[PDB]
From a paper:
2′,3′-cyclic nucleotide 3′-phosphodiesterase (CNPase) comprises 4% of total myelin protein in the central nervous system (CNS), being the most abundant CNS non-compact myelin protein4. CNPase consists of an N-terminal polynucleotide kinase-like domain10, a catalytic phosphodiesterase domain11, and a membrane-anchored C-terminal tail, which contains a cysteine residue that undergoes isoprenylation. The catalytic domain enables the rapid hydrolysis of nucleoside 2′,3′-cyclic phosphates to nucleoside 2′-phosphates. The CNPase catalytic site, lying in a groove between two lobes, has pseudo two-fold symmetry and contains two apposing His-X-Thr-X (X denotes a hydrophobic residue) motifs, characteristic for 2H phosphoesterases 113537.
In P296G, which exhibits a higher kcat than wild-type CNPcat, while kcat/KM remains in similar range, the mutation-containing loop α6-β5 is disordered in the crystal structure, but adopts a different conformation compared to wild-type CNPcat. In the P296G structure, a 2′-AMP product is present in the active site. In contrast to the wild type enzyme, the adenine base is in a conformation similar to that seen in V321A before, and the β5-α7 loop has similarly adopted the open state. Additionally, the activity is probably not hindered by the observed base-flipping phenomenon, as demonstrated by P296G. Furthermore Arg307 has moved slightly away from the active site to the general direction where Gln307 would reside in the R307Q structure and Arg307 in the sulphate complex. This, again, suggests that active site loop dynamics are linked to the conformation of Arg307.
Author numbering: 161 to 208, 212 to 293, 298 to 378
The structure:
Amino acid sequence: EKDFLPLYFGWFLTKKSSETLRKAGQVFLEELGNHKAFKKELRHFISGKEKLELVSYFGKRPPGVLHCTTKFCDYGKAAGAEEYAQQEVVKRSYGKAFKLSISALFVTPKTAGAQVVLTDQELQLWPSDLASEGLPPGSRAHVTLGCAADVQPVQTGLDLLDILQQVKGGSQGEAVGELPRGKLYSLGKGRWMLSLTKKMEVKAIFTGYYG
Ligand SMILES: Nc1ncnc2c1ncn2[C@@H]1O[C@H](CO)[C@@H](O)[C@H]1OP(=O)(O)O
């Protein structure tokens, strides 16, 4: 017969790095939800002067260890899944330890996440399958921290690219606040970005999740 692939490949953060990044994620949501600049724009965030707690809003969280997905394969069902998995670099990198650089945390009405900036060696593990929005490959790279109730997986990546495209255009604007980890930017349409002063490094293992 034939070997079937994972549900997806990706970098899976270590227990330690997962707990650090998860904790920073919640603090950001707590800080953002309580920031005056965010409350001003709540009507651009939800359709519903009360306060919204974003930890609650992003109720659908990764339950185990956080991860940075590369190729979603659906056991080979997804286009290009087999071609991605058959690559040498993928087979060679399987079970290898990597360090991922987090450059920012972001929030939209649909998802909450951390932006990952991949190295050139890590970029070799990015699927070529990934409308381009004139951004370099790997721009979508991220760790999901939370999702709104009716949101489906893929949306976090889309949300990030939209944001990075807005930043690209220079329409990110002056910062609207300073948080302990960096500057907060209001991109409108319920979109928010914390640019980390110091990029956060997390340890991960590249491997396949079967579920
Ligand atoms: N097209 C797709 N369908 C389902 N999951 C996808 C996907 N593309 C990427 N993924 C990722 O696969 C994992 C399981 O669904 C999720 O972490 C998701 O990343 P996400 O964090 O943006 O949701």
